[PDB]
Design a protein around this ligand. Sequence first.
Ligand code: HEM
Ligand SMILES: COP(=O)(NC(=O)c1ccccc1)OC
Length: 289
Amino acid sequence: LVHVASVEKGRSYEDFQKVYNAIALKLREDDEYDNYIGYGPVLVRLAWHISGTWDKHDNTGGSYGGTYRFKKEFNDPSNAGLQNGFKFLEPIHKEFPWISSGDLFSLGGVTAVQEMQGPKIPWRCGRVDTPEDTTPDNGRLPDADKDAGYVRTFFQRLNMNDREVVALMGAHALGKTHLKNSGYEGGGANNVFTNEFYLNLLNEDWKLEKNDANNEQWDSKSGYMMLPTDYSLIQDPKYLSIVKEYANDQDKFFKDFSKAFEKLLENGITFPKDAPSPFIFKTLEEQGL
Ligand code: HEM
Ligand SMILES: COP(=O)(NC(=O)c1ccccc1)OC
């Protein structure tokens, strides 16, 4: 099972920079969503959920096929709340109908990270929409009520190592939980990309409590929360070492996150030797827009 990248016919960097700019401008103007958090965090989640169905064993799932557009995946209970990101991107897709679904969903995650003052994330085009029958079954995305052992084992399926896992989890500095989506409540409601996740993990006084949906979560007096799977990163001695590294080195965290996130969005795709180099898009700020 091979998924070959195929560049949308006759399109070049400037075409994709246009799509980036439309997403970025809409992020700026549709700023009231989720109590003024804006759509940055949910688009990052969306890009992760469409990628995180990949299975290294048989090469099924992942971002290539854009299969989130089909009802089985769209209605996965693990995807509750992501409809909001879909609705955000829908008018963009009408404006640029030439872009594939997988390219649009993954580009939306890249745009959101960079527009939230995160690291540059190189991105490659050429995902190709595949038929409804290529949609993975529900149940490939991870549960939040588990320990470090489960996290490590789960992420092996996506071919991610300990450092890649800890770096990717720093995205939990963004956005918040919503009781209606996941049965978890609270969070910091942040829309600037920083290494605060690790600082919070190490500096807050956490207390395990049951919440209003009867799930266990870690709460701090300051009002922050951590999922059981977040808190597992300071329970396991290998993850804890890396948490301390990122808490103490913002630049290292940005660079590692960029690498891991691009790998996540590219898993399962074979790029021809003569495919274009990855693109690095300019932010609105860098264009003076
Ligand atoms: C063990 C793996 C993970 C688990 C169990 C997990 C679980 C969750 C849960 C339960 C929520 C709250 C959903 C809601 O109530 O709206 C959430 C939010 C979020 N997750 Fe994760 N997550 C994981 C890994 C990741 C990764 C790898 C990323 C991206 C690189 C990511 C990005 C986000 C973002 C940005 C939000 C906030 C979304 C919003 O504010 O709407 N997560 N996650
Ligand atoms: C940085 O805010 P947080 O309170 N964690 C979150 O806001 C958060 C965000 C998304 C998913 C889970 C927690 O830090 C302990």
